């Protein structure tokens, strides 16, 4: 058998393709107990108590909800049988090879969970997660309601100057409503919003005198399917244009709202928060993922399990906006 330390050496050694939305969640807190403290994350002294309510059949049950300074994150726990005879696309040598593939698959399950939690927190200001007594609960971080907009880019006589002004309103509202007052320079478009912005913008956007300047965070996405850096939109305020068409799997959905545009700043200063994983003898383990191997009977197999308890909390919930453009 291998110790957690030995399994972490393997699990952590390789490089994994960059996460798009988490680039705005650079900070990290590995909490010492089972609870996450928002007072140690959220900047706004009025917004340090997010509203947590059960999400039952899509509907948020606000009645049985409360404001809380502290949260108990549910464990993300992939568990797989270690079969040395397992089919891997590329005796003890093969056993180790199986463990490493499984550890990589587990690390991916945790990493993608962080990314989708980042996507939801940044886009909506709230994240739907697994609860303690309910299968799903909503953690509302209280982003200003003016930062969730609606417009119709499919209406008659809409121009590129009108579309940029919708985007600019959003960044000016962020400047007004955010702690820092940061000027947004990044605009993540969903695929339908982008196609819409290009349907209307055409000649004025990509032509001989286009606004798009198509010419090192912008080049790390070349080999990433779903992410496309389009260039800076030159304005007499040079906007960075991102298009996100990434999909993930639910027990397959789009990471970014396809018919919307999200504006975001580095001032969101999102924090990857992690609860400590309780271990019988070793006590609490403050880790992002925690691999454990063991032999058992009933069934007579060897198991590998990577446990983690995450939440992606924004420091400044008001440092981003979402603008829906179609229906």
Author numbering: 4 to 93, 109 to 233, 240 to 260, 264 to 278, 282 to 357
What text appears in the publication on this structure?
Here we have determined by cryo-electron microscopy (cryo-EM) structures of the head and tail components of YSD1, a phage infecting Salmonella Typhi. We investigated the structure of the recently characterised phage YSD1 as an example of flagellotropic χ-like phages and more generally phages with long, non-contractile tails. Samples of YSD1 imaged by EM showed characteristic features of siphoviruses: an icosahedral capsid and a flexible tail tube of ~220 nm in length. Cryo-EM analysis of YSD1 allowed structure determination of the head and tail components at resolutions of 3.8 Å and 3.5 Å, respectively, and the generation of de novo models for the major capsid (YSD1_17), auxiliary protein (YSD1_16) and tail-tube protein (YSD1_22).
To investigate the assembly of the major capsid component, we determined the structures of the major capsid protein both within the assembled head by cryo-EM and in its soluble form by X-ray crystallography of the recombinant protein (resolution: 2.6 Å). Comparison of the two structures revealed major rearrangements correlating with the transition from a soluble, monomeric form to an assembled capsid. These rearrangements are unlikely to be caused by crystal packing since the same compact conformations are seen for both of the independent molecules in the asymmetric unit of the crystal despite completely different environments. Taking the compact crystal structure as a reference, these rearrangements can be described as the stretch of the N-terminal arm and E-loop in opposite directions with regard to the central P-domain. In these conformations, the two structural elements form an inter-molecular beta-sheet with their counterparts of the neigboring subunits within a capsomer, which results in a circular strand exchange. In addition to interlocking the capsomer, these interactions allow for quasi-equivalent interactions modulated by varying bending angles of the N-terminal arm and E-loop. These quasi-equivalent interactions observed in the asymmetric unit of the capsid ultimately allow the formation of pentamers and hexamers with different curvatures, which are required to assemble the large T7 icosahedral shell.
